[PDB]
């Protein structure tokens, strides 16, 4: 089972966001510490990415390329699931030091999203994804989100999608039979996957929004954030970069 041997070893752990919880509760203190959780989330994806199976066939400027597209969608996914193990969901789990309760949630000004983040969130449990099913599936996000007019070399990038796919079906099916099973489940992890996407779009233009007008409000953006919330976020906002749906939405 090399393929997951990998995945299980490259996965990140725990990332502090550095939030003081002796602070009071206030946007622009929550929002900068969500900021700051980013830019620390970031250099683990990329340290992650780069050892994932089959990743240095990319061309260099699309392995840069693909991690600052789709960064969010793999990291609401993976806070979605820690929320899952850690507090069954019930609140949003950013980090061990940035715990979203219900007044968080109003404070951060993002309390729709948030509500539809512990949603995304119940769905581990409701479906009963397996640690490897996670696994697969964060990966896949990687993939998930690309240019309209494509990569520098979108061949290799279309190969690696579809092992990863492939993967992903062999993970469902070591363990069952007489396949309306394996076709129903791998139908139910496509639409959770895809359910991603609007999810992260919201929060693209969300965190667009304040990059703006983020003096007025007092909020810090790391470098980092910053750089790709200003140059590669607004690709996605305008149309020039779009996820990859499985099924029309
Ligand atoms: C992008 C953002 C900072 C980083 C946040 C993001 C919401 C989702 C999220 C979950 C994490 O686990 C890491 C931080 C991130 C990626 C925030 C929405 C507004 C804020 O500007
Ligand atoms: O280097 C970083 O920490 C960073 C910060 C933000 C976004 C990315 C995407 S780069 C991914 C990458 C791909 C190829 C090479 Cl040579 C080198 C790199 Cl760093 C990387
Ligand atoms: O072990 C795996 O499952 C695995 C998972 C993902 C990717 C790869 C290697 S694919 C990388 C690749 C890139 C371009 C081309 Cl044309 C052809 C190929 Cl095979 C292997």
Redesign the pocket.
């Known amino acids: 089972p090399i393929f997951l041997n990998v995945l299980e070893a490259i996965e990140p752990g725990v990332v502090c966001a550095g939030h003081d919880n002796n602070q009071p509760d206030s946007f622009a203190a929550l929002l900068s510490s969500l900021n700051e959780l980013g830019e620390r989330q ?2 683990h994806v ?1 340290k992650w ?2 050892a994932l199976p089959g990743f240095r066939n990319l061309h ?1 400027d699309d ?2 390329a693909v ?2 597209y789709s960064w969010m969608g793999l990291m609401v996914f993976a806070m979605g699931w820690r929320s899952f193990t850690n507090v069954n969901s019930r609140m949003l789990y950013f980090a061990p030091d940035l715990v979203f309760n219900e007044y968080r949630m109003h404070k951060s000004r993002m309390y729709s999203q948030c509500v539809r983040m512990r949603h995304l969130s119940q769905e581990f449990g409701w479906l009963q994804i397996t640690p490897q099913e996670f696994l697969c599936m964060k990966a896949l996000l990687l993939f998930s989100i690309i240019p309209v007019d494509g990569l520098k070399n979108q061949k290799f990038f279309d190969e690696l999608r579809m092992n990863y796919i492939k993967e992903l079906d062999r993970i469902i099916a070591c363990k069952r039979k007489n396949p309306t099973s394996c076709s129903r489940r791998f139908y139910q992890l496509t639409k959770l996957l895809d359910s991603v996407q609007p999810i992260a779009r919201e929060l693209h233009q969300f965190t667009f929004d304040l990059l703006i007008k983020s003096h007025m409000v007092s909020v810090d953006f790391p470098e ?1 954030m910053a750089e ?1 919330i200003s140059v590669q976020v607004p690709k996605i906002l305008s149309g020039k970069v779009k996820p990859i749906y499985f099924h029309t939405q």
């Open positions: 970031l250099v990329v990415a780069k260099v392995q840069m991690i600052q980092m790709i």
